[PDB]
Symmetry: C5
Subunit: 217 residues, 5 copies
């Protein structure tokens, strides 16, 4: 983390063991690419030098698989950034090494000069995680997901909602998918119960109506 | 959280990682809408700016399903509040944005001006969670719940008590349901044992009598 | 908790999140009424105002069932205390509200005037938990417990020891039950092995002899 | 714990909740008598007054069974110490009560006078745990342990190594048992694979050779 | 840990209980020799005297098996170091005891004189863990690993990637193994799906292509 000395001096202290425990526990239970890890890190990564955002990501337990896809995607995003900002004709500017904080000494990362670099680094990592989770089809194809046999509608809803959120499409498309799919991919037992309960509004029904009917009596 | 400087100045510090771990552990084991989460948050949300009450809720792991119902219910409650307090003719008053702390800068949230806003925000979230848990019928219909085959009476009692508590009805109704249902929805093995043990007081028996008889020899 | 300012002033700080995690983890793994929770709370409840002893108890995860029995038993004990100390003819004395710290403001609880109240409150809660665990027959009837088929003698010993401890009887009775039952309620496989190993001292054998024989070769 | 004030004054602070969590987690996962608990406590018991070493032991979750054997063994060791040091003819000396810190007030325990008592108390507890684990045959008889069917050689090695360590015999005996038993108590599938892989050195083979052969291709 | 007093004095404080919890949790879930433990320790072992690096390793829960192989390998590496640096003809130099910090008092370890010793000790332990994990074939032979029946390609990828990383061979060899094996050791269901999806690039395909095809629709 970056420490703001009273005189405005900036120094680096190791990520507090407690912060690793929270990030790691989210990483074991939910995916390293899971939106929950993406959020936790974004809440706690306002005070983290560029190197730490990268190190915490490497240290967090998770499959070598996802850590492999993220490393490739993170590099790919960095490539695009570099073609975008040719080296600076006047002034230091930002090079991929500076933004990824490779070649710079830990204390230097805290120095305010890199203020921009922490932000961009977090941006790529939080872009990388989003891209990896979508590719991992951990949510899966949105229409593809269907109710498990003898499964609570809420659980199907949880998978269906995650898939609808993961797809990179405008909100209106997500809304139509959320209302229409909830019934189409639903199991017959909830489907029939919803069909009678919500009548002919099954397509125009909200998630709340469908989840206060199949899950409940 | 809000920090009261000795000079009475108010500053914001991130929720301590430890506080997220306790809230998250309750959220994984018990529901994000579970009464236990509702209590923990209410014990630790006296010092939390309006934004944090909302952020901690979003970050806590839980189904996207419940996080979907809560977001809708929280908005619905905010709507009712706004129809109730038309904009202020004289003075700032409270707008939905101020109470939900959207559009305000983090440090500003701590400023005492928003004292009222933290309270209302916590009120809606703690109302929202209550409403979502009741809708989720996670306790289920109160009379509907019945003893599982080969299940300890205490476990049936735990489901029966939760359902009786969740229903939004006056305490006397809850008392009648607690005494009468405990025997009616009970399995025959406890039912017969209680019938002989408590004699003709099975309807007028307390939970203690029924739980010191079927669970015990 | 109660904070002793250097000038002897007493102020209240929220129970540290860490202390709730330890108490909660004991409560999920072992019973809220389990002796382990009874001990942890008694080690950490010397500095807790009366309100906190009551709040921590409500917040700790546990069945609504036990939380129901404890609430009734705690009230029952408070009743007995009140019939015992009729209101004070001269002086404030202690009323049920003061001891349960209901109607008093948080900061007031820390004030030394209530020193007696924290002690009594902890006394009732720690009496209540003991009574609830015994009623819950979570240890069960002491003679009733018997060795599970294909179960280590140590495990049977653990249930047998807990039941022998829970029964509210003089130590000599507990000693006789511990020595005699260990063999009588034991499974035939340990029983026969102990019968040959300890010879005719099976009744006068200690737990150590029986547990260094059936568990071991 | 004992706090060394700058003026050399000694005061007692409660064991930090975090220290109980680490000791408790080791106690649930590994035995209260497990060598791992024996080590953790010995690393953190240099600053603990005699009373705390005893209290932490009582509070740690574990079977009432082991807590029963340890209490007896701890008393037995204290007995031997007392027959060894008849009361002091001149000077306070150490009595069983002082070493076990029973009858002394908490703050008094921290006072340097008891410096010797903390050491002896920890000595008996760490002797007691060692004795209880050996008696519990949790490692079991060393030769008796054999490879489980369809079990990794490393797992058999882990049980075999623990049993070889638990037996109170000179290191050379442990070395012979470690080299010879590793093959004799091994399952035929590893046995045959090792017999071909290590040739006629199966008796003179180290653990490394045997574990780089059966576990690996 | 080593504490840098403002005057540059160096003092030792016990490893904070929190740091043991993070290292232990990684050790229970992942191997004590697992790369994740190797990393965590390397992030937190810049401020640890030589003795602590060794003690934390002994205290961390893990099989007595791996703790046996590591102890042997650590000694073996120390041997090589000693044949390499014959005792110092002029000056203290480093002896195996100084680097392993055996015979030196705790406070002395923090003294800057041993600065070199902490680094070397960490070097051997982090070399030892790497060697033990490779020997443990916990990743296993790289070509040997194959897709489990009805297993997600990502899981096979995770085992395949770990094995490819563990083998001590130049990166180009790892790249060829990663691209070629991913298809060869893959199960027929992913194999056939990949064969059609990636066409004739199955050998020249990256991990990303193969994991966006078999795992996803």
């Amino acid at each position: 983390p970056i420490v703001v000395q009273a005189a405005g001096g900036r120094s680096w202290k190791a990520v507090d063991s407690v912060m690793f425990q929270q990030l790691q526990t989210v990483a074991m239970q939910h995916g390293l690419v899971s939106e929950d890890f993406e959020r936790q890190l974004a809440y706690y990564a306002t005070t983290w030098t560029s190197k730490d955002i990268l190190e915490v990501l490497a240290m967090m337990p998770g499959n070598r698989a996802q850590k492999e896809l993220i490393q490739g995607k993170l590099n790919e995003e960095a490539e695009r950034w570099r073609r975008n900002n040719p080296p600076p004709p006047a002034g230091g500017g930002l090079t991929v090494d500076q933004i990824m904080g490779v070649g710079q000494t830990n204390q230097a990362a805290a120095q305010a000069n890199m203020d921009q670099a922490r932000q961009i680094c977090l941006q790529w990592v939080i872009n990388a995680l989003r891209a990896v989770r979508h590719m991992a089809h951990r949510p899966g194809n949105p229409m593809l997901v269907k109710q498990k046999t003898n499964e609570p509608y809420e659980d199907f809803a949880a998978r269906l909602l995650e898939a609808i959120d993961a797809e990179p499409v405008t909100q209106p498309i997500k809304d139509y998918l959320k209302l229409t799919l909830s019934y189409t991919n639903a199991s017959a037992d909830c489907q029939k119960q919803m069909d009678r309960t919500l009548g002919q509004r099954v397509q125009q029904a909200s998630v709340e109506e469908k989840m206060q009917a199949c899950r409940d009596v």
